Ligand SMILES: CCCCCCCCCCCCCCCCCC(=O)OC[C@H](COP(=O)(O)OCCN)OC(=O)CCCCCCCCCCCCCCCCC
Ligand SMILES: CCCCCCCCCCCCCCCCCC(=O)OC[C@H](COP(=O)(O)OCCN)OC(=O)CCCCCCCCCCCCCCCCC
């Protein structure tokens with residue numbers, strides 16, 4: 028007796044909060060944090076969708092979503108470590124050389 | 128039901144009493160008594176833990192339904208574990224998992 | 229006959245608060261955690277006491293913290309060299325109340341045999357000592373006797389129970405000296421075994 | 427007064443009794459570790475505070491309570507207070523699934539050992555938070571090394587337990603202890619048993635796999651009581667997963683469970699007293715190169731035998 | 738590492754555990770001060786006294 | 798399970814809102830771990846027991862362990878950004894706030910117009926998820942192993958020291 032609309036609304040709220048955190052923060056670590064929030068919100072939305080229909084498909088795509096999240100966080104933190112190694116700051120506005 | 132909701136209430140009381148016990152211990156400790164850059168190896172090992180942990184979750188999901196999946200599922204999980212061990216051999220043989228070079 | 233620290237005063241001590249203070253003192257004296265601090269040969273006799281043949285563990289004083297925050301007893305067992313005296317002072321400052329000090333050996337008592345340019349003549353020049361142990365080195369059982377002396381000193385001191393109420397001053401009992409207490413039996417000694425025997 | 431409410435109150439009281447006993451057993455097994463190290467080291471241990479030293483734990487408890495509560499000035503207060511809280515509650519909730527007797531269980535969850543894995547990850551978080559919040563280079567570096575150890579062994583903790591899970595065909599604890607109704611799982615899952623024992627010693631920061639220097643007062647006591655509660659939890663978990671738990675021929679189920687758990691606690695103390703501490707690189711090489719492929723091959727052979735025996 | 742080295746190391750760990758257990762089954766070597774008094778040899782160098790002659794006058 | 802679902806969702810929303818506005822990286826990671834525990838409680842309220850178990854096992858037990866590892870590797874004490882607090886001034890954050898509010902309004906309007914019979918919350922066990930995972934979803938599992946292998950190789954190649 029939990030509506031599907033409420034779970035989807037909660038997931039959409041978490042997704043837009045993650046997108047806002049991804050946009051308004053120049054720190055690369057906070058952008059990776061925002062990316063984790065958005066992909067976790069997408070996974071939560073899929074879990075809600077699979078639980079409404081009574082199928083394991085939601086949890087299977089949750090598993091695929093968090094496999095992607097783990098590997099993307101790995102690559103993003105490796106790139107963040109490399110950025111901090113070669114330029115000692117995580118401000119991405121310095122990383123803007125290609126333009127036009 | 129009755130047994131299930133009783134076990135749920137027991138688990139809730141377990142959580143509440145454990146949290147309250149730790150909080151009360153810290154509060155009693157506070158109130159009583161008078162007064163007067165790391166190397167990349169840590170990132171590498173944590174990343175390896177994350178990747179092999181999600182591959183472990185795949186094996187967790189397989190292991191609880193082995194009999195219902197049959198020999199086909201055994202073949203598929205054998206391919207999965209073979210790719211796991213090939214990745215592990217690749218990591219070991221290139222010195223990624225060696226703490227000292 | 230007590231001593232105030234923040235003054236020769238009297239005994240301050242509801243009857244429930246006396247029992248509470250007695251229980252606090254009992255728990256403090258029955259669980260004393262020394263600080264692992266290797267200065268000189270006196271520390272070798274201290275860790276000889278900590279081993280199986282003497283077993284200071286029986287008194288509840290075996291924990292031997294390597295961090296000054298956890299420990300509440302400083303056994304200065306060694307010479308107070310001039311380079312290490314600021315180190316000893318900093319380690320004593322890092323300790324938390326209540327804390328007690330035992331000088332072990334003649335070096336920690338007064339400088340001992342080393343009346344020399346590079347040695348501070350006693351740790352009581354800069355650290356308030358609670359129990360002094362003569363010897364060079366004191367034997368392990370002498371360290372355990374001093375531990376028992378510290379225990380009976382702790383067992384009747386008056387400290388505040390909580391820091392939000394009551395008198396926050398620390399009262400240390402003026403114990404009768406061991407020399408005057410043992411003079412009644414030491415003087416009565418007449419004959420000792422001759423040194424030619426085993 | 428209704429029988430359903432009476433049953434609810436009885437189950438709540440059962441969980442409260444279980445919680446009080448495991449906390450008391452963790453503290454008294456800190457004391458028992460002191461006494462057992464004394465026994466194994468040709469001495470007595472604490473035997474003067476009360477009869478046989480039985481009041482020693484009260485003495486350290488009073489000393490912990492009436493000490494100066496101290497937080498470093500240039501530290502984070504919230505994380506510093508939070509790390510012992512996690513190190514206590516994580517392994518306490520890990521014990522919250524162990525069935526000590528038929529009918530004496532806190533929560534008969536359908537995840538079970540997955541809940542144990544969640545609690546182990548939170549214990550790793552406790553170690554990391556303790557190291558970061560102390561604002562000390564030594565403690566931070568020690569937490570880095572200890573957390574990399576615990577990651578290198580939590581990488582195969584669950585994979586060691588998957589042999590037992592595969593044989594039982596379930597994640598439930600009671601189903602696992604019922605699957606060993608004839609043979610204990612230490613016989614078929616022997617390699618899973620040794621790998622789980624190694625991983626359980628390693629994730630509990632116990633000898634020979636051992637950031638606490640800035641902690642003092644009741645926080646240090648909370649850290650140590652949480653560590654010994656984790657010892658109790660891991661011992662009871664391996665009793666339930668590999669030694670049948672409460673099943674036995676003659677003794678009552680609690681007598682068998684308590685004897686097996688106390689034997690493994692004594693084995694913890696003997697492992698601490700006996701083995702020397704290996705180096706860091708050899709420990710992590712053993713965790714990655716040896717134990718993880720062993721757990722994978724154990725799971726594969728277990729599945730092959732299970733499917734072969736399913737006629 | 739080598740499998741033979743692993744087996745030899747496991748056997749040696751078991752041997753060390755066995756030796757420590759047999760140490761637990763041995764006699765305690767603790768002298769229980771202060772209930773058990775310390776035996777000191779007659780020429781032990783402890784507290785200093787001034788003595789008397791057989792006539793009872795101080796010998797110094 | 799209804800009250801648990803709403804309280805866990807409210808806690809997750811509040812913790813995420815604290816995450817996107819906080820300036821301390823470790824405090825932000827702690828609040829996001831709280832949010833991940835809350836979303837796992839949401840999963841357990843809806844009967845997706847395996848999803849919540851993996852949310853604490855992997856998402857709130859492995860990935861942000863890696864995040865906390867990286868943060869303490871960098872020794873991020875709030876330098877050159879905590880001295881700015883640029884995202885707290887209106888001229889940086891109001892624009893994206895209207896952007897996200899408009900997107901949330903559109904998505905909510907789309908959500909409110911769907912057939913909704915409610916979620917019964919019947920517990921879907923991990924056994925059924927494992928049956929479907931190695932039944933109709935075999936190639937998903939194998940190519941997900943290959944995907945994690947690719948991420949492993951990429952992160953090793955980029956995040957070396959030399
Ligand atoms: C410092 C404090 C921080 C906050 C700590 C937590 C505060 C709240 C504590 C009390 C919460 C209420 C009690 C929990 C609910 C109990 C009931 C329950 O979980 O039921 C759901 C399910 C039941 O499964 P079962 O009954 O077996 O299945 C048959 C069909 N129903 O069972 C399950 O799904 C079980 C799995 C979920 C269990 C969650 C347990 C707590 C997890 C969080 C621990 C946090 C530790 C501290 C912080 C760590 C670092 C951030
Ligand atoms: C060089 C390259 C690398 C080479 C490989 C290196 C790694 C090798 C790792 C090997 C791991 C082997 C694991 C074998 C497990 C097989 C047993 C098993 O799982 O049997 C299942 C069956 C119970 O299942 P079931 O009948 O369904 O009942 C459940 C109730 N619902 O159980 C039963 O019916 C009971 C079966 C008992 C079998 C006992 C004997 C075999 C297992 C113990 C081995 C002990 C080895 C000791 C050390 C040897 C020297 C190293």
Ligand SMILES: CCCCCCCCCCCCCCCCCC(=O)OC[C@H](COP(=O)(O)OCCN)OC(=O)CCCCCCCCCCCCCCCCC
Pocket residue numbers: 623624626627634660661664690691693694697704705708709712738742743744745746747750751
């Ligand atoms: C309730 C839970 C608690 C249960 C308590 C009982 C179980 C406790 C389990 C403890 C496990 C400790 C494991 C320690 C592994 C250490 C591995 C290591 O680092 O080995 C390195 C060592 C030398 O390696 P090498 O390559 O030669 O180095 C050259 C450098 N100059 O290599 C070697 O020395 C080779 C051998 C390595 C170790 C093999 C495995 C030994 C495991 C410990 C002994 C267990 C015995 C049984 C105990 C009771 C079991 C119930």
Ligand SMILES: CCCCCCCCCCCCCCCCCC(=O)OC[C@H](COP(=O)(O)OCCN)OC(=O)CCCCCCCCCCCCCCCCC
Pocket residue numbers: 620621716717720743744745746747748749751752
């Ligand atoms: C992940 C881990 C994988 C590896 C472990 C897998 C499980 C165990 C499988 C069986 C292992 C057998 C290992 C080989 C045992 C016999 C060889 C041995 O112990 O060699 C070590 C040592 C060699 O002797 P050396 O040091 O040269 O001294 C000169 C003596 N003339 O000789 C000695 O020290 C003397 C003999 C000692 C014998 C010790 C016990 C051997 C049998 C153990 C069986 C299992 C015990 C389980 C735990 C029991 C206690 C709780």
Ligand SMILES: CCCCCCCCCCCCCCCCCC(=O)OC[C@H](COP(=O)(O)OCCN)OC(=O)CCCCCCCCCCCCCCCCC
Pocket residue numbers: 128132135139798800801802804805808831834835837838839841842843844918
């Ligand atoms: C009190 C004021 C606030 C205090 C601080 C916040 C504390 C946590 C509050 C939220 C979580 C606990 C909510 C209370 C749960 C109590 C048990 C309950 O209601 O169980 C119902 C249901 C059981 O499952 P089912 O079989 O469907 O039941 C139907 C009955 N026939 O249960 C389920 O299906 C699942 C139940 C929820 C999942 C387990 C608990 C998860 C806890 C996550 C905590 C996250 C961190 C919180 C941090 C707070 C501070 C910031």
Ligand SMILES: CCCCCCCCCCCCCCCCCCCC
Pocket residue numbers: 443444445447448451526527530658662678679680681684687
């Ligand atoms: C390390 C052991 C931890 C045990 C925690 C649980 C304690 C529960 C106490 C229950 C006692 C009665 C058990 C049922 C009756 C069978 C045994 C009777 C004799 C005790």
Ligand SMILES: CCCCCCCCCCCCCCCCCCCC
Pocket residue numbers: 120892893895896
């Ligand atoms: C130094 C470079 C900084 C770049 C910052 C970029 C910020 C972009 C903010 C966009 C704000 C949009 C607000 C809503 C616009 C109207 C609705 C969408 C278009 C129809």
Ligand code: SF4
Pocket residue numbers: 268269270305306307332333334335336340363364365366
């Ligand atoms: S008093 Fe004697 S034994 Fe002690 S430190 Fe000084 S020289 Fe060494």
